[PDB]
Each structure stands twice: as structure tokens, then as C-alpha cells.
């Protein structure tokens, strides 16, 4: 269906400890494929997926040069934002940035992205029309006027309309076996007697990709979404994800509760009960 | 590929 490529950036200042720490990652859907850490013995854009090692040395030389330029620019922005907000130079501040593009099944662009944040709150972002900005405060409007005079959005619209969607299609083709093939979840239900008259039914969903999944319990036809303990989708570690939902069921009525799982890899939603 | 842009704030 719809696919996306994302690039995350994080810069945390280390006053007196040296250079600020810079960590950036790249994602195609929910799959990490590139990485660059400033605290590396030899910092270079490192691969994290098997279908990206196929690129030549000139590819990794550009991505490393670009990541190092983003690090040195973020290092200057950390000093600049101290003047915008009149903050002390002895405090640690965080600078975050994320840009990317979304494509649908037709291979065309759906939406471009470019957002920035300072100390966890929004700072300045590129609007959906790829031609205007949205500043969060008066200090962010200073950056807005400088980026509009330098025509920064003119390069962003060319990248998001062109280089972002074109390189995403070649990544989806080179990784067609992992990015375009969805892994259905492995489902099962466990029983845990909390007391002699009460029990808990837990519906499991393990080893699925992507992370988008919906676990909903139903008691003989009606959902108990309010009192269903659901945990956030967690990564298993091998590019797969896990999720479970639990309900406090009175003892003896276990066969009146059904679990419904929805995932893109399933042709139709599954229905599972305890099965003792 | 990444974005080739250098834009300080």
C-alpha cells in the first residue's frame, strides 16, 4: 500500500564535555537501514539493512559528508538558540529534526515532511504545500525570515517532489522481499487465574510487520475497549513487533470472550478464543 | 539518499 521514507536527527549539547552528541537514523516504513553516530571510532553512515549494502562507495561518501555537515550545522544552531531564548550556556539543550516523504501504491507523492524541535517542543516546520513555513514562537520567526530569504523551501520542494520519492521506489524494489512483503502475526490466547473466582485472558500477537495492528476483545458480540488492558506495540528486536491485550474475565465464562486481530498481512481478521 | 541542505537557524 502506502510507503514512506523518514530521516530522524537528534543533537544534544554537552557543555564542557566536548562536541554535542549527534545521532541520526533513516527509516523505510518501520525498517532501519542507515545510521550515523558522532561518538563512533570512525563515524560514517553505517548500514542497518541487507538491501542497502549494495550501494557503491560514492553513496556512502555522500551520506557521511551530509551527516557530518548536519552535525556541524546543528552545533551552530545550539549556540544560536541560546541567544534567541536568553538561555544559559551551562545547560543541556536538545535539537531534533525530521524530514521525509510519503508515497502510495501508485508510486506518487502523498505528503512531504520537514519539522524541527527545540527542547521537545515544536520550533519550525515546512507546510504541506511545500511553499510556506509555520513558526511556533517569535524566536522561530527569526529563523523563518532567514530561510525565506535564502529560499530554503525551494530546495525542500525539489527534494520531496523528486529525489525523495525516486530513491524510495528503488529502495522498495531492492528490498521487495522485506519491505513489500508483510509478516502476519502469530496469535494465541493464554489463561491466568488472578484469584479463585476471577481470571485473565491475554490475546497475543507476536512477530508481525509492520507495527500497525489492532487487538480488540469482544464479549459474545460486544467490545470492552474501555477496560481492555492494551500495551503499546513494542519491537521484538528482529525487525518484528509484539502486542497483547488482556481482560479481567469471571471464571467460567472464558468461552464468551473472543479476540479480533487486524493486520495488513492477514487476508481477513482472525477470531480466536481460549481453547483450553 | 539524504537531503543535501545546509541551513542554520
Amino acid at each position, epitope marked *: 500500500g502506502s510507503h514512506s521514507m523518514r530521516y530522524f536527527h537528534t543533537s544534544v549539547s554537552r557543555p564542557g564535555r566536548g562536541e554535542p552528541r549527534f545521532i541520526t537514523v533513516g527509516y523505510v516504513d518501520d525498517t532501519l537501514f542507515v545510521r550515523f553516530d558522532s561518538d563512533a571510532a570512525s563515524p560514517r553512515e553505517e548500514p542497518r539493512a541487507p538491501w542497502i549494502e549494495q550501494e557503491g562507495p560514492e553513496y556512502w561518501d555522500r551520506e557521511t559528508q551530509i551527516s557530518k555537515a548536519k552535525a556541524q550545522t546543528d552545533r551552530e544552531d545550539l549556540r544560536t538558540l541560546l541567544r534567541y531564548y536568553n538561555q544559559s550556556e551551562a545547560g543541556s539543550h536538545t535539537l531534533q529534526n525530521m524530514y521525509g516523504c510519503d508515497v502510495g501504491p501508485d508510486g506518487r507523492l502523498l505528503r512531504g515532511y520537514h519539522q524541527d524541535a527545540y527542547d521537545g517542543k515544536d520550533y519550525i516546520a515546512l507546510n504541506e504545500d511545500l511553499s510556506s513555513w509555520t513558526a511556533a514562537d517569535t524566536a522561530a520567526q527569526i529563523t523563518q525570515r532567514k530561510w525565506e530569504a535564502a529560499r530554503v523551501a525551494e*530546495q525542500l520542494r525539489a527534494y520531496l517532489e523528486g529525489e525523495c520519492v525516486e530513491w524510495l521506489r528503488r529502495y522498495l524494489e531492492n528490498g521487495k522481499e522485506t519491505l513489500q512483503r508483510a509478516d502476519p502475526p502469530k496469535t494465541h490466547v493464554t489463561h491466568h487465574p488472578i484469584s479463585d473466582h476471577e481470571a485473565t485472558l491475554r490475546c497475543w500477537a507476536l512477530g508481525f510487520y509492520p507495527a500497525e495492528i489492532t487487538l480488540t476483545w469482544q464479549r459474545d458480540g460486544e467490545d470492552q475497549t474501555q477496560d481492555t488492558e492494551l500495551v503499546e506495540t513494542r519491537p521484538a528486536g528482529d525487525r518484528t513487533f509484539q502486542k497483547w491485550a488482556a481482560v479481567v474475565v469471571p471464571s467460567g465464562e472464558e468461552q464468551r470472550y473472543t479476540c479480533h486481530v487486524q493486520h495488513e498481512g492477514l487476508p481477513k481478521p482472525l477470531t480466536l478464543r481460549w481453547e483450553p | 539518499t539524504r537531503l543535501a541542505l*545546509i541551513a*542554520p537557524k
Partner: T-cell receptor
Amino acid sequence: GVTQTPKHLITATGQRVTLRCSPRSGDLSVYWYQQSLDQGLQFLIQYYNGEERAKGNILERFSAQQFPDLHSELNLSSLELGDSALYFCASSVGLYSTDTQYFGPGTRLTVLE
Amino acid sequence: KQEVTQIPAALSVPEGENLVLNCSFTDSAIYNLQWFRQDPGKGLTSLLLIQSSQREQTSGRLNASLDKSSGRSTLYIAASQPGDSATYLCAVSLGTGAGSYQLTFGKGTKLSVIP
């Protein structure tokens, strides 16, 4: 907007010259270039807000510095025959990759025996 | 690693003919591509600034292209007037060292639009 001083320079081998440059009022970055016949326009050094930003294959006997008033100077010591070329000065608003640089008229240097 | 190249060295063309100036650059993290004209006395004056991801830029009778895959650029001059006679330099801003960008120029093509 970019001005250079002096305009022309005729000197002998082994001497020292000083090239001054005043960027635009709104520009915080200064660039130094050398245009010779054998290599064309070659980048020397770049200063941004008083500190050195980028540096090419500039020789050790070429000294430069940006002052707090954003104007730059370039001292070429122990001049040789090969140093006879055109020295341009450029400036930009900042470090923006989507913006352009603005060159000055250029200082022509000629070193003789 | 970075070495821009322009071909041909010189070009003398009668007035009114359309022109094409080629430019080739080496594979690097280019940030933009410019075309400068160099007049005697006056310094360099920018004509077109092609962004990193852009493939075309136009302004009047000037139309320049950019192809990072092949690493070539082409400036199209229409209705060659005697005022267009100057040296046309092909400049690119490539990522150099570690985090720095350096504007690299080509040898240049001197033009003489014979009226």
C-alpha cells in the same frame, strides 16, 4: 557591495602583501579565491562570523583572519613567481546552501624577480 | 576528488544563433550548481543557481540543466547578443573534508558573439 583593497599590486620575489576585503553589511561569511591561468579559480579559505569555516589547499605562508567588524585580510608572505594571479573576495549572508555568493572586483597581483 | 571541467575552451559564434555550454563534475555531495559570467574589470555575476535536487533553471534567454546521475550540466543561451560575450564559469558547491562545502569552479569557456 563587496569591495577589495588594493586593486593592483606589483612587487618583487620574497616580499609580503596585504589584501583587504569589506563584505556586504548583511553578510557574515567571507570567501577568498585565487584565479590563476594554470588552475583557474581555486578556493583558498572561508571565514564565518570571525572564525575559520572551510579551508582548501592553502599554503602555510598564506595568512588570513576575519575581524569582529566582519572585514577580512589576507597576508601573502614570501611571494613567488607562481603567486602572480587574480585574487577575488566573495561574501554570503551565511552558510546557506540555497543562497549564492557575491564576488568583488578582484585584486591583481604580479610578482617579479 | 573534485574537478569541474568545461568544454570547449573558446567559442566564437555569429549573433542570433542558439548556444549550448557543457559542464561536467565529479561524483560528490553537491549542494548546488551555478553559472557565472566574468567580465573584464567587473567581478563575477551570478546568472543561474540550480539547487541540489533541481534539474532545470530558467531566466529569460538562459536555460541551465543539472543531472547528478550522469554528472553533467548544460547552459542554453538563446538569441546570442553581443552583450553576452564574456567568460562563462561552471561552479558547484561540493561537500569537502568533513562537514564543509567548497565552491569549485571550472576552467571556463570564453564566448565572443560576433555581431
